[PDB]
Amino acid sequence: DSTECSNLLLQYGSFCTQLNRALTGIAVEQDKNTQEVFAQVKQIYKTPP
Amino acid sequence: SALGKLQDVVNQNAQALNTLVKQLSSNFGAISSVLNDILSRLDKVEAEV
């Protein structure tokens, strides 16, 4: 029953999907990062002159 | 005599104001550099997290 906790967990990735697939009996694939990107937007404001 | 004393006082005040402006500019430059470094460190920490 926490909002900020879920907001921070949403950035950890889709590990829950892999956990569910492993629990159902489907093996986890071992590959590179073709779905998760470490991108950034740099929303920092400009300093006043 | 009074005019000479007043002129000397005004000259001393002008020199003190010039020194104050120089020291103020130096301190403001230092504070701006500190703030820039702090913002850079904040951005780095946010990206790392």
From Swiss-Prot, chain A:
<comment type="function">
    <text>Precursor of the fusion protein processed in the biosynthesis of the S protein and the formation of virus particle. Mediates fusion of the virion and cellular membranes by functioning as a class I viral fusion protein. Contains two viral fusion peptides that are unmasked after cleavage. The S2/S2' cleavage occurs during virus entry at the cell membrane by host TMPRSS2 or during endocytosis by host CSTL.</text>
</comment>
<protein>
    <recommendedName>
        <fullName>Spike protein S2</fullName>
    </recommendedName>
</protein>
